[PDB]
Design a protein around this ligand. Structure first.
Ligand SMILES: Nc1nc2c(ncn2[C@H]2C[C@H](O)[C@@H](COP(=O)(O)O)O2)c(=O)[nH]1
Ligand SMILES: [Ca+2]
Ligand SMILES: [Ca+2]
Ligand SMILES: [Ca+2]
Length: 341
DNA sequence: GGGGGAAGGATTC
DNA sequence: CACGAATCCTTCCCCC
């Protein structure tokens, strides 16, 4: 099996660059402004020019501006990036018939048939790279290997605007030399748990008793890491189906006042419904981000679909449940709809 | 003992 | 100061 992973470079920022080419070469910082105060919010993404100075996703817009006061700061336009993304996916869709659109800027292609051997895969990568740059002016990094994980890891090492193949010989090398933190799906929480177990490399996961591993990072994560360390990971390429739709907004000020929160919650619901399509959810969750940035939620599954009126009403009950069962003030509030009919 | 949901939280990208 | 969604997990519960 040959997997070709495609990852659009600094996507949001690059799109803004495509929509306004005079931006090229300048530090471009796409931000999600929260509205709690001038420049409150975080950086969603930044082009590499901004990144080489530490301005990256997750840092507050205020910290980025102190580092790069003259960069171009743009409000994130999710809808625009999604439409652009959809076009690129369609473009890729004609290269493989087997595609897994992992997110707005990532997709895996099972080109096991379309190609044979990594030379032809590599060449196909360039075909895809040139095609995307041609029709959309979007540079992407391509990762190629035997499975999604290493295909993704290949892209991680080749970005930006690169292409890399990780042959079966290197797979083995990385299995014992790649920091396990750099393995997809292993975040800081898991990375630390593995460090405390003596696992710093994928192969080290073979030094632990499975049940001890399972006990520490969960069975699913244990079997995942083990399979990769044995060079046996082989999950198929298949785009998952949207299982939930929601929206969560940040309030101007933290609150515990029902009437003060409702408007935000209702706006969340309204946008969530517009997003749903003709899709009808049977489950609804009200999600709140507490003042200490903790996330709490209360939901309910109905035996039928949820009309907007029912949503408006149940969400208020769920929000009252949250306030009733958690003392903290609420910073962000929203809803998530799932279990579509 | 354990299937099968549902619920609330943990994690990751 | 810090802004959508999938899986996975663990807990609880109904119940055969
Ligand atoms: N809003 C937001 N989007 C992020 C963040 N990190 C990554 N992304 C998205 C941006 C898009 C995709 C690739 O870049 O990942 C983040 O911290 N905030
Ligand atoms: Ca990515
Ligand atoms: Ca990317
Ligand atoms: Ca990591």
């Amino acid at each position: 099996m040959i997997v070709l992973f495609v990852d659009f470079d600094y996507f949001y920022a690059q799109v803004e660059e495509v929509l306004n080419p005079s931006l090229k070469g300048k530090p471009v910082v796409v931000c999600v402004f929260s509205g709690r105060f001038e420049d409150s919010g975080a950086v969603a993404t930044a082009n590499y020019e901004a990144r080489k100075f530490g301005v990256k996703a997750g840092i507050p817009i205020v910290e980025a501006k102190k580092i790069l006061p003259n960069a171009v700061y743009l409000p994130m336009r999710k809808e625009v990036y999604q439409q652009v993304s959809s076009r690129i996916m369609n473009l890729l869709r004609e290269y493989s018939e087997k595609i897994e659109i992992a997110s707005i800027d990532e997709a895996y292609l099972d080109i096991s048939d379309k190609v044979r051997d990594y030379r032809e895969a590599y060449n196909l990568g360039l075909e895809i790279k040139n095609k995307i740059l041609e029709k959309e002016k979007i540079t992407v990094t391509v990762g190629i290997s035997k499975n999604k994980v290493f295909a993704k890891i290949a892209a991680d090492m080749a970005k930006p605007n690169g292409i890399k193949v990780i042959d079966d010989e290197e797979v083995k090398r990385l299995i014992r030399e790649l920091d396990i933190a750099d393995v997809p799906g292993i975040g800081n929480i898991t990375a630390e748990k593995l460090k405390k177990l003596g696992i710093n490399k994928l192969v080290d996961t073979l030094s632990i008793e499975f049940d001890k591993l399972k006990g520490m990072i969960g069975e699913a994560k244990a079997k995942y890491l083990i399979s990769l360390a044995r060079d046996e990971y082989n999950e198929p390429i298949r785009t998952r189906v949207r299982k939930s739709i929601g929206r969560i907004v940040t309030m101007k000020r933290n609150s515990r006042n029902l009437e003060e929160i409702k408007p935000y919650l209702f706006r969340a619901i309204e946008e969530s419904y517009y997003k749903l399509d003709k899709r009808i959810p049977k489950a609804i969750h009200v999600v709140a981000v507490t003042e200490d940035l903790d996330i709490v939620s209360r939901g309910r599954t109905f035996p039928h679909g949820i009309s907007k009126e029912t949503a408006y009403s149940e969400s208020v009950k769920l929000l009252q449940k949250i306030l009733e069962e958690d003392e903290r003030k609420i910073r962000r509030i929203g809803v998530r709809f799932s279990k579509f009919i």
